[PDB]
Amino acid sequence: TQSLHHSSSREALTDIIMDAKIRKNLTFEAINEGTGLSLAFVTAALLGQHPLPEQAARVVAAKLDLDEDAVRLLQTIPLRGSIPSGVPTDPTIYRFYEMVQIYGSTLKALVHEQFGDGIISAINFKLDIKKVPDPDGGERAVITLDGKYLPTKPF
Amino acid sequence: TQSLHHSSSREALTDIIMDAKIRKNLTFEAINEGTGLSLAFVTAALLGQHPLPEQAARVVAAKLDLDEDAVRLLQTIPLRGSIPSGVPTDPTIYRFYEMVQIYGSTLKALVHEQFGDGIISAINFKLDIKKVPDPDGGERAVITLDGKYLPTKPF
Amino acid sequence: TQSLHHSSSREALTDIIMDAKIRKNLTFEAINEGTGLSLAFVTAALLGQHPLPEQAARVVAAKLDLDEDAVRLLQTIPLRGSIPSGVPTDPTIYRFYEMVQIYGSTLKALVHEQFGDGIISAINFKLDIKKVPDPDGGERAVITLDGKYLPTKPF
Amino acid sequence: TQSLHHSSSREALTDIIMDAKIRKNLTFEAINEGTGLSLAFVTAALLGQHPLPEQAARVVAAKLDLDEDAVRLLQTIPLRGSIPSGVPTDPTIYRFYEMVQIYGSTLKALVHEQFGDGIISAINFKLDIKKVPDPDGGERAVITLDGKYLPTKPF
Amino acid sequence: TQSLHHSSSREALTDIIMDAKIRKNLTFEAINEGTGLSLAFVTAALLGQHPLPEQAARVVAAKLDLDEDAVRLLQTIPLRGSIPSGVPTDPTIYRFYEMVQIYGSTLKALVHEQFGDGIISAINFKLDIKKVPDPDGGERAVITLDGKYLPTKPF
Amino acid sequence: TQSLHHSSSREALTDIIMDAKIRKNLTFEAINEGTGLSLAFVTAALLGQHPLPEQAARVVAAKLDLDEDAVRLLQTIPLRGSIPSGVPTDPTIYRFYEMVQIYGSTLKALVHEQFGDGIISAINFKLDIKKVPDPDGGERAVITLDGKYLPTKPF
Amino acid sequence: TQSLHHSSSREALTDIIMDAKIRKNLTFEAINEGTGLSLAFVTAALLGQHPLPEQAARVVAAKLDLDEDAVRLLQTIPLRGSIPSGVPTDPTIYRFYEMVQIYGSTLKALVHEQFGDGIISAINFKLDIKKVPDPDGGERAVITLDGKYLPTKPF
Amino acid sequence: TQSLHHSSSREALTDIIMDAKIRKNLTFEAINEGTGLSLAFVTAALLGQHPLPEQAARVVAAKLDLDEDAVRLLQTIPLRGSIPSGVPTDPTIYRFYEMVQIYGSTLKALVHEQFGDGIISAINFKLDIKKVPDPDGGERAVITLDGKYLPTKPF
Amino acid sequence: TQSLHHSSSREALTDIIMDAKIRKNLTFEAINEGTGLSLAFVTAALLGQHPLPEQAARVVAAKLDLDEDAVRLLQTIPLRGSIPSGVPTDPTIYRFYEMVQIYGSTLKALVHEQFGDGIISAINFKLDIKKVPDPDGGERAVITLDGKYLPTKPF
Amino acid sequence: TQSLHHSSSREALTDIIMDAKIRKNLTFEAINEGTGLSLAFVTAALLGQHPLPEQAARVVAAKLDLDEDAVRLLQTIPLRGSIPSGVPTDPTIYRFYEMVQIYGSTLKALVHEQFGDGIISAINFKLDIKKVPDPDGGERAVITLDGKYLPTKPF
């Protein structure tokens, strides 16, 4: 599978994608209709973090009026990473980084307690975000991280 | 409420906690028996990231054979942060960081799309981890991030 | 709501805004005349840190002779962050960074003493700057940070 | 006036002060009784960021049961800086850092618009934090930053 | 399984281990006799990067005259990371870092071409080093990185 | 031998090479046809990390429709380095960095035990990656680092 | 007064200024002939670190054949900072950085001894450089830093 | 001359020097009585940045009641540097760093204009600090940097 | 003497210089013919690290067919520094950094022993590299660093 | 050969070495009597950067009155690196770093011109420093770096 060596080409496309998305006043959910894939995956791809299968690449390119060059580049594996600074400054992204900063030691401790030595995978991995009401007024976001346990065993 | 200016004295207590835990071969779940609180919160408190209410601090110090000085220190608010390096080197913790590194801009975009401008809070926030079977053989971790949406409104 | 994956397209608009502002010899106060919003919020929005509602975006656009593409982009939520390096070199901004560096631990200590565990929010939050006379001669700036207390409670 | 060349010897006193404070269940407000100085300044001094005049040093040393060496060290000017990393990990401190990250360019812009070229001082400067009720439920912190304007004039 | 929250308790043991090794003039191969484990894994464990099963912990402890406290700690999962700076200064370690700096983009490209999107695991993974002669005089090291391919598939 | 002072010019050529590669749907193995050189070396050269001999340079230029300016720049020694950030964010690349992070001290210890004082060369060095079917289902990557032992030695 | 949010716009003007200065073989002293201001202040302005008053900006524009847009931009307050890297690589600039690196703690100690707690201002501040003969042959630079003392007084 | 390889033994001595100086309530000017050397040089030596000739070392040790070990250590050349973080956080020291930050490019430009290519030395160099009254009220510090010009000539 | 403010206009010339040297397949020694200056100085100047006297500037300009704007710019003093990252990643440059990293404290200790307190100058300094045969087959590089000794004397 | 995992144990020995050296008023040259090794290698070993053969280790220990444990520690391979900050602040060391900063790209260029692709090794490497007179008065240091050329050949 084709892969990218640098972010520059996939970043240029992402700017074009965002330009068309705003110009047409489209939501990611609207862009994702007809892909057969999850919104979180296709939104990540459009923001340059995943390749798309051909059918998904052509349906988003149809809604955004993108040409064939964009369809080919959407199918290429990018050089991944949404936070080049390592630690974000944007408050929305920072809160998610802060969750890991606070509970990082706890998540390691409980993973080792309930699963054993090793990791929870970030590749054999799926992500979901859901809007639920708050019983005391307002809304909450439930973000589900679903990762395979990979054990570390002596060899 | 009493607060700490540094992480060191709470780190010294954390070292005493982990030593007693290893010496007694105790799980965090067993230590959490009878607190009335979530295992994620209490484990984080033991690892120096949270204060404990008095009843929970006494019940943990009783299991770990800790003195009254530990009881008072467990009730003090710490200077928080489980990853002083900013980005972890430990693979288990790094995977959670990588989840944010990869999906950080996607989470921002989808939060703004489904909620609006603002953030998902990391303070009005609860964390949970559950072990589920993998349909293709193996174990999976389902980590749930549950935060309040705080809107950014023009003023 | 429309969001921006990175700030350079908003940076380019910010460059155009500042260029029009200098050429027309305009103050932010004059630009803000018909927005119906606070000068602090709208100046930040012009500098790429906030979106504007449509009608407020149109009134700064009429002042600065910006086109409809600028009106659409001004309404988009940016990737926030006004200090790229994390630490400013500019003396004016640095003094505000220095206030946090000097009194940061005091602010935490007194928040915990007077409110309890948790944070003062930087999202449910309003900023104001006011010029007052100095009794000994000269002028002083009174900057008001007004943030909601969000408690950290055991769960 | 006596001054210090490093953080360490003042850090050791700050550790002793915080240890005695927690062991005696004292608030910073109770420690500040009789000093004739503001809670924000004295709290900062106890946390290593300011010297205290002799009478203030003796009354906090009596309340905390500190010896004559502590009185002298409390009157010494420290090497200042409450955030050694430059960027805090603690959420309570981080929020104030975030306020500067977001509004830093705005603060500079309005300082130059409303005052002129130059800075708002961080030395000819006072800080206050006040707890007020939020009209819609809860509490808010009103943090006031009050600094002298120092002009930059051509020479 | 017991885990550790930071380096120091294993760091202290690692120094004790190294001190005894140098005093007894032992090789890692000699220390590893009878464990049934690979020399690279056990050496890594002794250097504080892996836990050991009880049999291997008691075996290495017998060869180094370590007490039962060391046996228990050698069975605990450490906070992993052998290069705290992230980039080493030691030339011997730096050469392996240089290999990744030079061929990093190549390995990504060839992994995606030959395997597909995804990663080569560093957890489902074993390391080996072998000494072979150089056909033009001298010796060469053959280091084998053996990791499981984890695909990234659209979801 | 001609060498480049920066990454800029060689980066522009890599963009053109990757664009031609994606457009023609070519593998690095297809581009490597009839060069007589290993796929890892030529791929690294195409990615701007090595110069190519004129014959190989003309071969891959023919298959990618590159002009004589590309033939000449492919023969120049670049300013090497594939990971500008020092630590990668891309998960595929990061896994290889993590192997050095975890096992770096072990590789140093075993190099010194099995060879002596000195280094395993990153210059007198060849890399190879092979796909090896994994026994438990799936595939494994066996990556071999083959470097010459260069002794460090009193003088 | 008009202010700038980024370094680049004045950076472009500085490049224009330097290009015109080199083409005309002018010294900063010649350019400063009719400004009515100090050489050190005006040179810093031309290098993008200060605004010029209107009549002084028109003098330097006449010497350098700059247009009215340059005159306007020269009167805008910049985002200040001449060493974006924080520490310079240039040897001429580095020597001044090194004087502060070496004598920084001494300057603090003697400021506190001779003035009291507080700072020597960098805003109420003038700089001067003078060339004097060295008694042992050669030349010396005498750089004078002249800053107002701002006390830190308890409040 | 005896030189020091790291800060620590000179660090500990500096701690002892400052401990005795505060306990005796001494000034650096009093400690410097009878050295025949400048206050800035001797203060920097006490702060770990310079060696002292034996007779100067013995008189500062006699004022502080230090032993013969301190006298020998004071004569050794330290590993120099008063700001280990590269950029200071202390406000008094930061102002001098900011001076170089703002005027660094101006100093280089006027050195090359008035002297030529090369540097103003930080080694063939003297520093002086002087307190003078401000005509408008208050006090000012006049810091003199006096360095030899060393040219860069083509060779 | 004409000086520069930033790297880029001289960087643009260095790109043009390097582009012409590759297209003409010239060596630096060939470009240096008839300059009267050493290859090490003129190579550095062509790489943007030094100014050239006018004759040397016109000579290299005729060799690479550059205009009079390049001749004048080549006579300007640049903002020096060949490694913007501070630490190189290119292996060829890194080895020279490694030499200082490994032997830096030794050079300091031996400079102080054989010369005294102070420095070996990097400005009153000449560099030379020569190729010599290795008695065991192959070739060695003998790089000579020739710097004036500048003493640090008490003042 | 025995090797060490961290710098601390050898750092403690280096501290003891320097203490005895200063206490005995010894030069590195006098400590190096009878080793049959060059001053630069043994000095670096004493500073924790190289191991010593048994005989050389015993002679420096007899000169410095170190015990048998120091003789064994002196024979172990350290974790190398004399500049933990990456870039030194000490002026004597910084000058040598500045030589590479300035001439780094020149050294690479001339190495590739005179030798070919590849490196000049820092392991098959010898360093020397000699004091020669300056024809204009004073002394100069001639530091010779003698490294084997290792080519990068296509494979």
Computed from CA positions of residues D64, D70, D73, D75, in that sequence, does the dihedral angle turn out positive or negative? positive
Q: Cβ separation of A5 and F14 shorter than 8 Å?
A: yes
- Is residue C118 within 8 angstroms of chain A, CB to CB? no
Q: Can chain F be said to touch chain H, i.e. do they have 3 or more Cβ pairs within 8 angstroms?
A: no
Q: How far apart are CA H74 and CA H10, in angstroms?
A: 8
Q: How far apart are CA J114 and CA I27, in angstroms?
A: 9
Q: Cβ separation of E2 and B21 shorter than 8 Å?
A: yes
Which experimental technique did the depositors report for determining this structure? X-ray
Q: How far apart are CA B16 and CA E79, in angstroms?
A: 17
Query: Pick from H13, H126, H8: which is nearest to H74 by CA?
Result: H13
Chain centroid to CA D31: how far?
Answer: 15
How buried is residue C155: exposed, middle or buried, by Cβ count under 10 Å (0-12/13-18/19+)?
A: middle
Partner-chain residue, chosen from E9, E73, E80, that has the shortest CB–CB distance to B15: E9
Sheet holding I139-151, edge to edge: I118-133, I139-151, J139-151, J118-133
Q: Cβ separation of F83 and I90 shorter than 8 Å?
A: no
CB neighbour list of residue B4: distance below 8 Å, 6 or more residues apart:
B10, B76, B77, B78, B79, D18
Q: How far apart are CA F22 and CA A30, in angstroms?
A: 29
Q: Can chain I be said to touch chain A, i.e. do they have 3 or more Cβ pairs within 8 angstroms?
A: no
Q: Can chain F be said to touch chain C, i.e. do they have 3 or more Cβ pairs within 8 angstroms?
A: no
Partner-chain residue, chosen from H83, H86, H92, that has the shortest CB–CB distance to G119: H92
Give the closest-approach CA distance of A148 to chain E in angstroms: 11
Report how many Cβ contacts below 8 Å link chain A to chain C.
Answer: 31
Structure tokens at A3: 């892969």
Chain centroid to CA B14: how far?
Answer: 14
Give the closest-approach CA distance of E30 to chain I in angstroms: 31
Four-point Cα dihedral A58, A60, A63, A66, nearest 10: -70
Q: How far apart are CA E45 and CA E33, in angstroms?
A: 15
Q: Can chain E be said to touch chain J, i.e. do they have 3 or more Cβ pairs within 8 angstroms?
A: yes
Query: Pick from F100, A116, B18: which is nearest to E8 by CA?
Result: B18
Q: For this structure, is H9 an active site residue?
A: no
Q: How far apart are CA D10 and CA H57, in angstroms?
A: 26
Residue A83, amino acid: I
Partner-chain residue, chosen from F87, F89, F98, that has the shortest CB–CB distance to B91: F98
Chain centroid to CA D22: how far?
Answer: 19
Q: Which residues of A touch C8 (CB under 8 A)?
A: 15
Q: Cβ separation of H37 and I109 shorter than 8 Å?
A: no
Give the closest-approach CA distance of C68 to chain D in angstroms: 24
Q: How far apart are CA G41 and CA G126, in angstroms?
A: 8
- Is residue C146 within 8 angstroms of chain H, CB to CB? no
CB atoms within 10 A of CB A106: 26
Chain centroid to CA J11: how far?
Answer: 15
End-to-end CA distance of chain E: 32
Q: Cβ separation of J5 and E47 shorter than 8 Å?
A: yes
SS3 A24: coil
Q: Which residues of I are catalytic?
A: 95, 98, 121
CB neighbour list of residue C30: distance below 8 Å, 6 or more residues apart:
C63
Q: Which residues of I touch G21 (CB under 8 A)?
A: 2
Four-point Cα dihedral E127, E132, E135, E138, nearest 10: 110
Catalytic residue (choose from H95, H105, H113, H139): H95
Give the closest-approach CA distance of D81 to chain A in angstroms: 21
Output DSSP code: residue G11: H
Q: Cβ separation of I91 and F122 shorter than 8 Å?
A: yes
Chain centroid to CA H134: how far?
Answer: 25
Q: How far apart are CA D147 and CA D132, in angstroms?
A: 23
Please, are residues A153 and E37 in contact by the beta-carbon 8 Å criterion? no
Q: Which residues of E touch B85 (CB under 8 A)?
A: 84
Q: Which residues of I touch J78 (CB under 8 A)?
A: none
CB atoms within 10 A of CB I140: 21
Please, are residues H37 and H55 in contact by the beta-carbon 8 Å criterion? no
Output DSSP code: residue I38: -
- Is residue E29 within 8 angstroms of chain J, CB to CB? no
Q: How far apart are CA A75 and CA A1, in angstroms?
A: 9
Partner-chain residue, chosen from J73, J76, J80, that has the shortest CB–CB distance to E89: J80
Q: How far apart are CA I145 and CA J28, in angstroms?
A: 22
Please, are residues F90 and A81 in contact by the beta-carbon 8 Å criterion? yes
Partner-chain residue, chosen from C9, C81, C122, that has the shortest CB–CB distance to A90: C81
Four-point Cα dihedral F115, F121, F125, F130, nearest 10: 60
Please, are residues E149 and F140 in contact by the beta-carbon 8 Å criterion? yes
Structure resolution in Å?
2.0
Catalytic residue (choose from C98, C113, C139, C140): C98
For residue J149, what is the enclosing H or E element?
Answer: strand J139-151
Computed from CA positions of residues E64, E69, E70, E72, in that sequence, does the dihedral angle turn out positive or negative? positive
Structure tokens at I136: 């065991």
Sheet holding E139-151, edge to edge: E118-133, E139-151, F139-151, F118-133
Q: Cβ separation of I112 and H1 shorter than 8 Å?
A: yes
Residue D58, amino acid: R
Q: Which residues of G touch C88 (CB under 8 A)?
A: 81
Q: Which residues of C touch G81 (CB under 8 A)?
A: 88-90
Computed from CA positions of residues H112, H117, H119, H125, in that sequence, does the dihedral angle turn out positive or negative? negative
Q: What DSSP assignment string belongs to H66-96?
A: --HHHHHHHTSBP---S-TTSS--SHHHHHH
Q: Cβ separation of E72 and B18 shorter than 8 Å?
A: no
Q: How far apart are CA A106 and CA B40, in angstroms?
A: 7
- Is residue A136 within 8 angstroms of chain B, CB to CB? no
For residue D15, what is the enclosing H or E element?
Answer: helix D8-23
